[PDB]
Design a protein around this ligand. Structure first.
Ligand SMILES: CC(=O)NCCc1c[nH]c2ccc(F)cc12
Ligand SMILES: CC(=O)NCCc1c[nH]c2ccc(F)cc12
Lengths: 304, 304
C-alpha cells in the first residue's frame, strides 16, 4: 500500500551521462554506443542565443572544438553532425555501459523520469509528464541542458526527452533524441509563450483508481455520466477531452476495482464542481495528473 | 527554475540490491563488501509473524538455508548473525560495486530516497521523510521488504532506512542498517498504531523559501512573528515546534531571499489561519514538508 510519485531507477542512464564543452559553454551529453548526443546550443555564446544561425556557427567548429569528458577521462571526437536541434558527436570509444535503448517521441500526457545533471554528473531524479502544451514542469538550473527524460521497459531505456531551455514563465522545453522540439518551441532566446496547460484527464482517472486501491474512497459518488456529459464539464475546467481510447486504457483499473470508468468520471465531475472541501486524496489537495494508467498498474502490481 | 520532489540518483544503490530467500519467503537484501543485510523476518512463515521468537526460529537456520542471488548468480553464504531486527549474511564475495558508504540513523523530519525493489530488482525511486511519529509514507507491496532509504554526499551513500512492514493504516515502518526500528514499532504482525503525524515546520519553511526563489510569492505577507507566538499557532495546527536550531538551519535561505525566518513564519501562520483560498504554491494545494533546508539549498544550487 501507499502510492508515490516514483521515477525509474536511474543507474542505466547515470552510466550514459557525459560533460560536453564547446568554448566557454558546458552542458550534458548522452553517450550511447560511440555517439554523444547534446543540445546544439552548446556551440552558442549567450550573445549567439538571441538569434543563432546554427549551420553558420557550426562551420566555425571542428571535432577538436567539442570537449567530451566521461568521469575524469576525455573522449576523442572523430565526427560531428547536427540532426535537428541536437549534435551527434562520434567518439572513438563505444560507451561500455550502453544499455539496451530506443529513442521514442512521446505524446502529451505521457510521464517519464528526468535525471537532472550538471557537468555530466547526476544530481537527482524526478517524474515529469509531457504537458498538453508540450512543456514540462522540471527542475533545471544553468548547466542542466542535455539532461534526458526516459522510461524503462525491464532492461530497455526508451529515451524520450533532452532538456534545451526554460521559457520566460519558468516551464521547460526540449526535444526528442532526434532533436525535434516537443511543441512549437525553438532553441532561440526569444520570448516564447506556452498554450493552455490543461489537466491530463485520463491520468487523473488513473490516479483516482490508485486512490481507491490504496483505501482513499471518500470521493466515490453515487453517480455515473457519459463521455459527452463528462467532456462538457472537462472543457469548462481546462481538462483534456476523454476519448474511448482513454476509457479502453483504464479498463484494467476498472476491472481491478469494479468501478466502471464512466462512474469514476462522474466522481471526478463532482470533484471539479464541489472541490476537495479541504480533504486530500493520496496526500494531495489537488487532482494529480502526472501518473499514466500504465504507471498506476506498474506501481500497484510492482513491475521491475 | 522549477522545484521538483527529487530523489538521489539510485545507480550506486541499484548495484547493492540482492534477492534473499529463506524457505518460501523472498525479500530484498543490501550487499555491501562481503555482507548482505536483510530484515530478520525473512526467516518467518506469515504464521510465525503473529508472535515470532527470532532467536528460536534462527536456531533452525544454517548458512545454506539463506539463498542470496545477485542478478542471476548465487552468492555463497559463509556466516549469518542477527543484529537487532536485521540479518547480516557473510558471503564469500565482496560486492564489486560496493560504493563508499555509511550507516546513519536519521532524525524525524530528515528526507531520504527509497529504491523500491522486488526479488532484488529495482522498480522505482522516490523521496520520503521520516515522519515525526517515526513512520514513512512509502509505496511498498509484498516482496518490497529490505528495500533501503539513503542519502548521497557526492560519492558516499549514507544508508538510513531498511523497509520491514506496513501498519494496519498503510503507513510504513523500518530500521536503520543496525536493525533498530525507527519509533516504537516491532517486526510482529500485531496491530500497532502510529502517533500524531505532525507537519515538519522547518521543512515547510524551507519549501516556502524554495517557492519565493522560483517566483511563487503571492503568500508573502506584511507581518512578522516570534518563535513563541508562531509555536502557539503551530501547536494548534499539529505542526512541530520551531526551535532556534531550525531558525539557524534556515539562515542561508533567509540570506539568499532577504526574508527573515520569523517573517516567513508569519506568512506560514497566515497560510494556516487563512488557508490557500484555492491557490497553489509550487503546484501544491497543501504545504509540502518533505523538503529539508539542505534539500532546498542542494536543488536550488545544483549540487551533484
Ligand atoms: C527564459 C527565456 O528567456 N527563454 C527564451 C529561450 C532561451 C533563453 N535562453 C536560452 C538558451 C538556450 C536555448 F536553447 C533557449 C534559450
Ligand atoms: C498491516 C499489519 O498487520 N501490520 C502489523 C505488522 C506486520 C504485519 N505483517 C508483517 C510482516 C513482517 C513484519 F516485520 C511485520 C508485519
Amino acid at each position: 500500500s501507499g502510492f508515490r510519485k516514483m521515477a525509474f531507477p536511474s543507474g542505466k542512464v547515470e552510466g550514459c551521462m557525459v560533460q560536453v564543452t564547446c568554448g566557454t559553454t558546458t552542458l550534458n551529453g548522452l553517450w550511447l554506443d560511440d555517439v554523444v548526443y547534446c543540445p546544439r546550443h552548446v556551440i552558442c555564446t549567450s550573445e549567439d542565443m538571441l538569434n543563432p544561425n546554427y549551420e553558420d556557427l557550426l562551420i566555425r567548429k571542428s571535432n577538436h572544438n567539442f570537449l567530451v569528458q566521461a568521469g575524469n577521462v576525455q573522449l576523442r571526437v572523430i565526427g560531428h553532425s547536427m540532426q535537428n536541434c541536437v549534435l551527434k558527436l562520434k567518439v572513438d570509444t563505444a560507451n561500455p555501459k550502453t544499455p539496451k535503448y530506443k529513442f521514442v517521441r512521446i505524446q502529451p500526457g505521457q510521464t517519464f523520469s528526468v535525471l537532472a545533471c550538471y557537468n555530466g554528473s547526476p544530481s537527482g531524479v524526478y517524474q515529469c509528464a509531457m504537458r498538453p502544451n508540450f512543456t514540462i514542469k522540471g527542475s533545471f538550473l544553468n548547466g542542466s541542458c542535455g539532461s534526458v527524460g526516459f522510461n524503462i521497459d525491464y532492461d530497455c531505456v526508451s529515451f524520450c526527452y533532452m532538456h534545451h531551455m526554460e521559457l520566460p514563465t519558468g516551464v521547460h522545453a526540449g526535444t526528442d533524441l532526434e532533436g525535434n522540439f516537443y511543441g512549437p518551441f525553438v532553441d532561440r532566446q526569444t520570448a516564447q509563450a506556452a498554450g493552455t496547460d490543461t489537466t491530463i484527464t485520463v491520468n487523473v482517472l488513473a490516479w483516482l483508481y490508485a486512490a481507491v486501491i490504496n483505501g482513499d474512497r471518500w470521493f466515490l459518488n453515487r453517480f455515473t455520466t457519459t463521455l459527452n456529459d463528462f467532456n462538457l464539464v472537462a472543457m469548462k475546467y481546462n481538462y483534456e477531452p476523454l476519448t474511448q481510447d482513454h476509457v479502453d486504457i483504464l479498463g484494467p483499473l476498472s476491472a481491478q476495482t469494479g468501478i466502471a470508468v464512466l462512474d469514476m468520471c462522474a466522481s471526478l465531475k463532482e470533484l471539479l464542481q464541489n472541490g476537495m472541501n479541504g480533504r486530500t486524496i493520496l496526500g494531495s489537495a489537488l487532482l494529480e495528473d502526472e501518473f499514466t494508467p500504465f504507471d498506476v498498474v506498474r506501481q500497484c502490481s510492482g513491475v521491475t
